[PDB]
Design a protein around this ligand. Structure first.
Ligand code: MG
Ligand code: MG
Ligand code: MG
Ligand code: MG
Ligand code: MG
Ligand code: MG
Ligand code: MG
Ligand code: MG
Ligand code: MG
Ligand code: MG
Ligand code: MG
Ligand code: MG
Ligand code: MG
Ligand code: ZN
Ligand code: ZN
Ligand code: ZN
Lengths: 89, 58, 238, 55, 355, 116, 180, 194, 87, 199, 190
RNA sequence: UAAAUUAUGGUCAAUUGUUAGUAUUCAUAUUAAUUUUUUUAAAUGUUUUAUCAUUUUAUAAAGGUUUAUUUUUGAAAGAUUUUUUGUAUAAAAUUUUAGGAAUAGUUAAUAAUAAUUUAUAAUUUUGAUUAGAUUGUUUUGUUAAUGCUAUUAGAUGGGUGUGGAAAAAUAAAAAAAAUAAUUAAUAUAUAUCAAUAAUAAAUUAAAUUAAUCUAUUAGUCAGAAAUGGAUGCCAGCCGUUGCGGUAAUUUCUAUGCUUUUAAAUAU
């Protein structure tokens, strides 16, 4: 959740929530610091995201065109076989 | 020919999944899985039939 | 309640459970008598140590079992006091005689379970003799000083700071581990110096220091000063 | 044969199975398999002059 | 499959037998050998000998096999409507799959995937992939596209040849353009007074007489949209002079004067003494016919009080880069195309100097 | 018609395996990452002040259990099982333990009281 | 966007949301319990199969003795084992290309495997979270920063295309005499 | 024949080998180093990096051998008393050795990498191994100890008493009295040596 | 097996019934005697059915509801259900 | 045989090698993490992997699509799987070749433990089992003194008819006493008497 | 584990090695029929329900399952099942609408044999070529009206006799002599 | 209209009832179930926000449906200075009742038509519509086997129509926009329909952490196992032929004796 501490700006109202998120400057500075640290984490995280993306793309190229090699040979063979069976026919 | 071959819950007794790709294209089902009404009761029909039995081509 | 019925967990050390009526019944039909051939005390030519490990006071109190009534193979679980490390435990004589089972602490006595005596490491009395005085004093401190300095033995120490007693490992205290075993935390020596409760304050000193110097703290600092001919592979980048 | 299906006898089951038998199915030749007799002699007294628009 | 009390997917791949604690046979300390064989292992039916699924049960001949050789030719046809939808989809995916997230290499991926799905990668797709890849400054993958097209025995039209020669020039490899020339564009002619100007589309398109439909085998009736069938009719507008120009550029780029002199001389002569061929109208698939919209609801030019926002209705920022203000090269007269050709040759001289 | 019950009772021997009883190499995870206890702040001086400032929810009445803890170390030495032994109800003890480990992480139990 | 919200199992955004890699298993006695690594949508239905993109694997959270390998006097190998099956082609696809999310427990797992760095939630409570000030960071950065082109090319090789053509395979792929 | 559709151009691919390509190599996809023992990998990594790479298997093997010569030097004279109620059993060394030999030769564990290390790892004094086992056979024949379990006659009533690894006492089984020397066990020892 | 004798068990093995009458009936020759037949009631889907069954049970102090089980055949024609215990 | 067919005893194997670790940017803060209590095995699965039919091709070090395993040692390192560990992830395989020496066969007299063999507990003593018709047993380590080529394999591939059989039925319906032929057993007495047994 | 006996069971939570994880649905329940109606008055005109009714579709014995392999799939490669049909035109009373009778196939695996069933379709012929008794090819398409998903793709065999019959002003085919069967006796004389 | 061999290959189909002249899948058998037994669930307070508001949080109430249920990306994923695209709502197959008749805001063309547009309309005996029963097309049991016999559950109209999509009025066990927490899997005594517990059911003892439990039935003519005592076509037994007529190895009772030991009995 978004943490609401007790020294956030208290809203005096009976018609609604008792505490408005508004920060003591200290809280803002703090939050900034913590969030810098997690930025450090997510940098490497998304770095790995796109790294694996190109890894997967490259493997797809190589294996898929190996596949197209073998497959085309197959369907060329079948087609030859057919036109032969039709000459025989 | 026996009871153990009746249980298709083994992956060895069941036509594999990828066939449905080979017919409708690869990664085709990921679309279907996000559909509004799914699996109650029915899902977008999953076609797996051994490729030498296909009525279309053969 | 309901959950009372659940069988406990049986870890790798422990054999047969006997938790079910089927498992209890055939042993319920065994009735032992102590003859001259069964009595533990007759066999002290062999099992003398086992005899001097028994708690003679506590067993006759709690179990109402005399020491002359205890078979060498006795299945009853009686109280023991370890004559090495001085800890109390409850087991059956049968299990100490048939295989060696005894206080659970002295299981980890040697530096590694897999290889019992294979250590080439010096004892504690030698490598770090300043530890022998920090051991909580049960009178067995001369036996505990005999252990390997790499030993995984779980020992209790009196904390320097608050003078209370906590429980840590000998090798965790020294920091040294045997080649081929798992490295401990690099800081383990400083951190086990005190109580788990007294440890925080002293080890937070250098951090406050490093944020005093540069006004900025990153744990990086150690690794950085580790930096101030390495064979490397040909790469396919080109 | 489970005894709850169809009649209380067994043979009632096989009498309704003959309704599903493959080589017994309804076609242009065999028709009205289930009630033949309600439709019997129905048009005897119905006189219908056949349809001729060609001489 | 998962998360249920009876969930089968977790048991469907092999696992070493688990004894962490007492599983009811007191497995932590108990040697389970006979328990393994007679109970834990699945059997054909209650009481029968254990059914062995191990590697020794299958024959040897499973490992004698080359890859993907179990596959058979799959003829999958589909509604005409669906072909249009699918070709469009693959086209716009080859252009770009994701916004800044697109790697150049992804165009190549999508072309390949298109083949793997048993579609025929028509001419539009090839040209698009090549232009995309080349404009990303990646020249090896462009030739890889061409080689894919050659392996599929798709006869390149004149447009496709143009694109591949653009890739050749920018790469400066003459040896590609030479083989490409020799194989495909040889018989390419110019247009003369006796020529008929843009040739009508002559293809029948494919139907079946009721005897063809009934008596033929299954494959003779199978029409997948195949690029080769209309190749004649893609070439009906005579873009030849472009091919000759590109080829001049290549022979120059690879540093050979005689051949270049040859192509450029042929081209010059024809441009002077032969009629200007009729240009082809804009390809519906490569560039899209503008669809009608009212421009009324639009962020105004001054919408942001801090700057000048460019808008769909008009451009207030001004041109970032100067444009030459000439129509697409095919709309030129023959003399104009002569001029254009010289400026092109010069541009290649410049490029070669910079390389 | 089957009134008779099963034909056989299938039972397997128990025969201890010398291989499964072989000594296991062990590490204690307190060796790999050493445990420690944070000393009280001026913000949170006592275990009771703590249980007071971790009391937020109407249904997590933490402050009511002050007696079930003798001191500071008693709190941070408790785990959930041993915390159940002492008779603290369910979601309450999860609030407590959560609060403790949170304070250990460098996040003190400062949060607004939602009861009102 | 439900009028009366389903109160117990809320989420973020509409359902089905972006696919997230979860660990889930039916609850049972602790002695038999296993988990499933599963790529599925954000909003689950009653049975988890309805939205299930892929099945990544089984993970058993019980340290096991290795009876498959021969009893080995090597110290480290006779620590107990923890068994997990990862499908890493599907993982790299989903995570990399499809841009998944991750719950924390699977993250810890895949960290152990070497597919991901250790998670955000794995805390040695020994060390604190670091401090920062921009001028010191700036001094360190001015101290060490690599060349622009080196960096650009590294980003090229990591993110965009890896496999490249050395001049050699060019020379080997370009046509010979009769069509040259 | 020529009715119904034109002949698909891809047919050509059958009769003409010119058109069989693979645009890429086997591992150009980023997997090139998969084969640890391929010449390509030996060229990429160089030798010292391969040493670094296999150091772990080397120390595995050295660990096996070290355990073996520890047990040999411990139990070498077969009969003594090495511990509180525990005494020497040749059988210990035997069974460990069999564990080793199964790591090498068995078809359920087949760990054969262990044997590629012998020309280096193997200790020079352990080269003669079955010789050393024969010497142990000679030491095993002492008169004060039982010919079957090698426990001392005076201090012990049964076979297998106070031995952790003993075969002779099983879970719900019974205790067997010590067996006595005579021509039977003499030629048993003999046949074992053989 | 004769499946129509079980009509009032309605697919259940045992039934619960309330006592109403107890009368006597004479079995099919050559078996003479008096067979005690209890006339019972039970309800299903708010229909009240009168069940008629053979009393083989042991009656103690006065009690109301019985437990009905179906058997094989008995001396007395027409009575399919038998009595297990009385509650 | 040994001289003529040298390649029938495998002297070679895929060496256990240490993998390089992936860099952790978080530095020392997380370095504790991958270092833990246990070993962590990871075997791959997917469409191209885990099929018994293809097993050797998948363990083949020459094949680049070869199934991938990894192990985190408790100190945090990573190494490739030992061949045993690799084989653990396939359904268990039985190898016994009957052609030269007899492979050891399961469900024998000296093999089968008591409760399956007899329906009673029978004490295991190494001396004089009358039921098993043996006089005495010296109990050496099974494969030690015997020659290795002699060890062939095991065969479990049949029904153990004394113990459990298919399509179990009563041999004879009357008298009520006979059961299926798997139920053989001595009569249990009228209530048990326990004699104290140090004797 | 479904292969283990009643007595052989220990844990009900897991499969120890492998195999199929099976829930036992209890097949023998002795389910019964409740009789709520008098044999005289049953509240339906055409049919009466006196016993337990077998339910499901494909769960129905004897099983009758879709057979892809017949004449239609023999001649055509269909993108989707039922995308092509060959049939006869029966009646045109509706403008630009041809009704078509078509055969398809059912397989009984118990007896190992096939049956042909028949079904009517509305097909859309713009321009109104189809005369009753034409052999036509028919395809799946865009939804046209409430019941028309099919259009006439090609006339295989036209009706030459019927067309010449129309040209002369006569109906394509003589109207069937009797209509549907009745349960009455119609006495209609002269 | 000829044999075949470079020899066991391409990896296991195998059926167990003691009946009573004969004809016909039908009592008493095994396996699977219900009879049958608290070791796997769980308590209320969802949460931010700019304040009487506005952002986030989309399929377990019932009704009874057999020519039936079908769909997008505009939300999130999602990467980026602004515009950008096209593909979707449609169908085909499989559909139950012992004895069988008509159904209906209704078809098709026109068109952003017509409570009275135009027409020789549509559904049905190749079984309709009403009406009964019933939660539909990878799940079970038996079996050597084409079979027979199960499979839950979940989509119930509109009426200021919000939302990307109505799935929108208790009944989680989906972390829900700051790392709440992971030393966690334990949840006390409730429920719904499930989830098979007599787990070495009897002699040498548990390489524990000692926690839950004190645990028994049947037969005794035929067919393993009998004698006294009553009773006298009675009382009663009855899976079945049948037994009971002062001598009942078939009833009742007492005592023994029999069993191949998760029970008899009922469905
Ligand atoms: Mg079957
Ligand atoms: Mg039963
Ligand atoms: Mg019934
Ligand atoms: Mg009778
Ligand atoms: Mg509902
Ligand atoms: Mg109805
Ligand atoms: Mg339908
Ligand atoms: Mg529809
Ligand atoms: Mg309403
Ligand atoms: Mg008899
Ligand atoms: Mg009786
Ligand atoms: Mg008398
Ligand atoms: Mg008598
Ligand atoms: Zn001790
Ligand atoms: Zn202290
Ligand atoms: Zn001895």
């Amino acid at each position: 959740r978004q943490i609401r501490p007790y020294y956030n700006l208290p809203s005096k109202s009976e018609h609604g929530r008792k505490m408005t998120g508004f920060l003591t400057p200290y809280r803002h500075w703090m939050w900034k610091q913590n969030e810098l640290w997690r930025n450090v984490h997510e940098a490497q995280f998304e770095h790995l995201r796109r790294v694996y993306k190109r890894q997967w793309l490259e493997s797809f190229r190589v294996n898929a065109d190996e596949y197209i090699y073998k497959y085309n040979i197959t369907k060329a063979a079948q087609l030859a076989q057919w036109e032969c069976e039709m000459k025989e026919q | 020919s026996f009871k153990y071959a009746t249980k298709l819950q083994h992956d060895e007794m069941r036509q594999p999944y990828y066939i449905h790709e080979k017919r409708y294209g690869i990664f085709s089902n990921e679309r279907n899985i996000a559909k509004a009404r799914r699996g109650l009761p029915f899902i977008t029909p999953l076609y797996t039939k051994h490729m030498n039995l296909w009525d279309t081509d053969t | 309640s309901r959950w009372s019925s659940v069988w406990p967990n049986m870890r790798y050390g422990s054999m047969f459970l006997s938790y079910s009526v089927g498992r209890k019944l055939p042993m319920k039909g065994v009735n032992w008598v102590t003859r001259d051939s069964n009595r533990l005390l007759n066999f002290s030519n062999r099992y003398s140590a086992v005899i001097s490990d028994i708690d003679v006071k506590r067993t006759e109190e709690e179990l109402n079992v005399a020491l002359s009534d205890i078979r060498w193979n006795d299945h009853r679980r009686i109280y023991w006091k370890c004559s090495f490390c001085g800890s109390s435990y409850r087991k059956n004589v049968s299990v100490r005689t048939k295989y060696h089972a005894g206080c659970n602490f002295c299981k980890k006595k040697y530096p590694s379970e897999v290889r019992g005596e294979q250590h080439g490491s010096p004892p504690v009395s030698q490598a770090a003799p300043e530890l022998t005085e920090q051991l909580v004093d049960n009178g067995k401190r001369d036996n505990l000083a005999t252990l390997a300095v790499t030993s995984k033995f779980y020992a209790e120490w009196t904390c320097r700071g608050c003078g209370g007693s906590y429980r840590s490992t000998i090798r965790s205290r020294t920091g040294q581990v045997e080649a081929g075993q798992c490295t401990l935390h690099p800081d383990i020596v400083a951190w086990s110096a005190y109580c788990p409760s007294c440890s925080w304050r002293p080890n937070m000193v250098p951090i406050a220091e490093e944020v005093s110097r540069s006004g900025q703290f990153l744990g990086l600092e150690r690794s950085m000063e580790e930096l101030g001919p390495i064979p490397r592979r040909k790469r396919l980048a080109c | 044969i489970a005894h709850w299906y169809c009649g209380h006898k067994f043979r009632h089951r096989f009498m309704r199975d003959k309704r599903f038998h493959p080589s017994l199915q309804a076609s242009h030749d065999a028709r009205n398999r289930f009630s033949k007799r309600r439709h019997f002699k129905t048009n005897r007294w119905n006189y219908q002059q056949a349809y001729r628009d060609m001489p | 499959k998962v998360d249920s009390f009876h969930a089968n997917t977790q048991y469907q791949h092999a696992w070493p037998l688990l004894s962490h604690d007492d599983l009811g046979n007191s497995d932590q300390s108990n040697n389970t050998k006979n328990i393994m064989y007679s109970m834990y292992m699945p059997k054909r039916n209650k009481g029968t000998a254990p059914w062995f699924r191990g590697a020794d049960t299958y024959s040897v001949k499973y490992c004698e096999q080359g890859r993907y050789e179990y596959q058979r030719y799959l003829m999958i046809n589909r509604f005409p409507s669906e072909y249009k939808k699918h070709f469009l989809s693959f086209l716009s995916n080859i252009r770009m799959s994701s916004g800044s997230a697109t790697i150049p290499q992804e165009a190549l991926h999508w072309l390949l995937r298109m083949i793997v799905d048993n579609f025929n990668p028509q001419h539009v797709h090839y040209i698009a992939a090549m232009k995309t890849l080349q404009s990303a400054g990646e020249l090896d993958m462009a030739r890889d596209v061409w080689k894919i097209m050659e392996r599929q025995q798709t006869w390149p039209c004149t447009a496709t040849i143009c694109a591949y020669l653009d890739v050749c020039v920018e790469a400066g490899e003459k040896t590609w353009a030479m083989e490409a020339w020799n194989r495909y564009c040889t018989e390419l002619k110019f247009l003369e007074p006796g020529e008929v100007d843009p040739k009508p589309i002559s293809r029948v398109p494919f139907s079946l007489t009721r005897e063809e439909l009934l008596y033929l085998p299954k494959w003779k009736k199978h029409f997948d949209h195949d690029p080769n069938l209309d190749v004649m009719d893609l070439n009906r507008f005579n873009r030849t002079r472009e091919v000759y120009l590109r080829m001049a550029q290549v022979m120059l780029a690879g540093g050979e004067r005689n051949a270049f002199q040859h192509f450029f001389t042929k081209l010059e002569e024809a441009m002077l003494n032969k009629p200007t061929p009729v240009p082809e109208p804009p390809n519906p698939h490569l560039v899209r016919r503008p669809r009608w919209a009212p421009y009324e609801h639009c962020k105004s030019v001054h919408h942001s009080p801090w700057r000048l926002q460019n808008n769909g209705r008009a451009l207030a920022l001004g041109p970032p880069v100067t444009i030459e203000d000439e129509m697409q090269s095919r709309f030129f007269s023959n003399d104009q195309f002569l001029v254009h050709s010289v400026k092109e040759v010069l541009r290649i001289v410049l490029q070669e100097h910079k390389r | 018609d089957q009134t008779y019950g099963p034909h056989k009772s299938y039972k397997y021997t128990y025969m201890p395996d010398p291989r499964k009883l072989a000594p296991i190499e062990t590490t204690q995870r307190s060796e790999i990452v050493p445990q420690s206890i944070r000393p009280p702040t001026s913000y949170v001086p006592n275990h009771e002040t703590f249980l007071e400032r971790a009391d937020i929810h109407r249904l997590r009445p933490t402050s009511d259990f002050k007696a079930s803890f003798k001191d500071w170390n008693d709190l941070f030495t408790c785990d959930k099982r041993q915390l159940r032994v002492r008779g603290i109800p369910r979601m309450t003890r999860d609030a407590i333990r959560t609060a403790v480990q949170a304070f250990q992480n460098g996040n003190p139990p400062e949060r607004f009281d939602t009861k009102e | 966007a439900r009028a009366v919200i389903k109160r117990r199992s809320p989420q973020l955004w509409g359902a089905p949301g972006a696919p997230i890699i979860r660990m889930r298993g039916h609850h049972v006695v602790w002695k038999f319990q296993s988990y499933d690594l599963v790529v599925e949508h954000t909003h689950k239905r009653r049975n988890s199969d309805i939205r299930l993109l892929h099945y990544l694997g089984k993970h058993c959270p019980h340290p096991q003795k290795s009876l498959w390998s021969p009893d080995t006097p090597v110290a480290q190998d006779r620590h107990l084992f923890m068994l997990t099956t990862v499908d890493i082609d599907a993982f790299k696809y989903w995570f990399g290309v499809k841009r998944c999310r991750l719950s924390m427990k699977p993250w810890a797992l895949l960290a152990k495997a070497g597919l991901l760095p250790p998670s955000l939630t794995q805390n040695s409570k020994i060390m604190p979270k670091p401090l920062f000030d921009k001028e010191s960071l700036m001094r360190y950065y001015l101290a060490n920063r690599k060349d622009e082109d080196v960096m650009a090319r590294e980003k090229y090789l990591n993110y965009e295309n890896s496999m490249v053509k050395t001049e050699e395979e060019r020379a080997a792929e370009r046509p010979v005499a009769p069509y040259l | 024949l020529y009715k119904g559709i034109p002949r698909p151009a891809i047919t050509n691919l059958h009769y003409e080998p010119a058109w069989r390509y693979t645009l890429y190599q086997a591992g150009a996809h980023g997997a090139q180093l998969s084969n640890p023992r391929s010449p390509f990998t030996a060229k990429v990594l160089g030798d010292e990096l391969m040493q670094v790479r296999d150091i772990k298997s080397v120390e595995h093997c050295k660990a096996w051998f070290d355990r073996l010569q520890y047990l040999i030097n411990l139990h070498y004279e077969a009969v003594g008393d090495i511990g509180e109620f525990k005494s020497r059993h040749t059988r210990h060394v035997h069974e460990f050795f069999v564990a080793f030999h199964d790591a090498l030769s068995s078809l359920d564990f087949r760990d054969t990498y262990l044997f590629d290390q012998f020309k280096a790892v193997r200790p020079p004094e352990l080269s003669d191994l079955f010789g050393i086992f024969l010497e142990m056979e000679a030491n095993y024949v002492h008169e004060d100890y039982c010919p079957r379990c090698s426990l001392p006659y005076s201090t012990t009533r049964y076979c297998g008493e106070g031995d952790v690894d003993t075969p002779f006492r099983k879970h719900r089984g019974r205790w067997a009295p010590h067996q006595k020397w005579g021509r039977e066990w003499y030629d048993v020892v003999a046949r074992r040596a053989e | 097996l004769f499946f129509l004798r079980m009509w009032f068990l309605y697919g259940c093995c045992l039934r619960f019934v309330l006592f109403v009458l107890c009368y006597y009936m004479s079995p099919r020759l050559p078996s003479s005697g008096n067979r005690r037949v209890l006339y019972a009631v039970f309800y299903l889907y708010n229909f009240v059915w009168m069940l008629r069954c053979f009393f083989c049970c042991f009656i103690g102090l006065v009690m109301s509801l019985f437990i009905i089980e179906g058997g094989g055949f008995v001396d007395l024609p027409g009575v399919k259900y038998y009595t297990r215990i009385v509650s | 045989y040994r001289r003529m067919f040298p390649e029938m005893i495998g002297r070679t194997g895929e060496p256990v090698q240490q993998y390089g670790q992936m860099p952790i940017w978080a530095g020392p803060h997380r370095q504790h993490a991958n270092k833990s209590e246990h070993n962590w095995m990871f075997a791959e699965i997917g469409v191209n992997v885990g099929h018994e039919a293809l097993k050797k091709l998948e363990l083949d070090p020459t094949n680049e699509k070869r199934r991938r395993f990894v192990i985190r040692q408790p100190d945090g390192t990573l190494r490739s799987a030992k061949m045993s560990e690799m084989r653990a992830w396939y359904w268990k395989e039985e190898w016994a070749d009957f052609r030269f020496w007899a492979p050891q066969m399961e469900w024998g007299i000296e093999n089968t433990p008591s409760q399956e063999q007899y329906q009673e507990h029978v004490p295991d003593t190494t001396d004089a089992d009358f039921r098993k018709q043996r006089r005495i047993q010296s109990r050496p380590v099974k494969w030690f003194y015997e020659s290795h080529y002699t060890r062939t394999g095991s065969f479990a591939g049949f029904q153990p008819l004394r113990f459990m059989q298919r399509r179990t039925e009563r041999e004879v319906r009357w008298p009520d006493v006979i059961n299926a032929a798997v139920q053989i057993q001595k009569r249990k007495p009228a209530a048990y008497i326990f004699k104290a047994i140090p004797e | 584990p479904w292969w283990n006996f009643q007595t052989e069971h220990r844990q009900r939570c897991v499969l120890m090695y492998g195999g199929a994880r099976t829930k036992n649905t209890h097949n023998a329940n002795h389910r019964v029929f409740i009789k709520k109606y008098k044999r005289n008055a049953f509240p339906n005109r055409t049919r009466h329900h006196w016993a337990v009714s077998m339910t499901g579709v494909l769960s129905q014995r004897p099983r009758r399952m879709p057979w892809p392999y017949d004449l239609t799939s023999l001649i055509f490669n269909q993108p989707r099942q039922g995308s092509d049909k060959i049939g006869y035109v029966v009646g045109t009373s509706m403008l630009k609408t041809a009704v078509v009778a078509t055969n398809h196939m059912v397989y009984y695996p118990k007896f190992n044999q096939r049956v042909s069933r028949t079904k009517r379709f509305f097909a859309h012929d713009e321009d109104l070529a189809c005369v009753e008794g034409d052999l036509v090819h028919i395809k799946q398409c865009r939804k046209i009206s409430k019941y028309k998903h099919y259009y006439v793709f090609s006339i295989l065999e036209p009706n030459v006799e019927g067309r010449e019959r129309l040209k002369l002003g006569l109906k394509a085919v003589p109207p069937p002599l009797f209509g549907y069967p009745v349960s009455r006796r119609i006495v209609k004389l002269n």
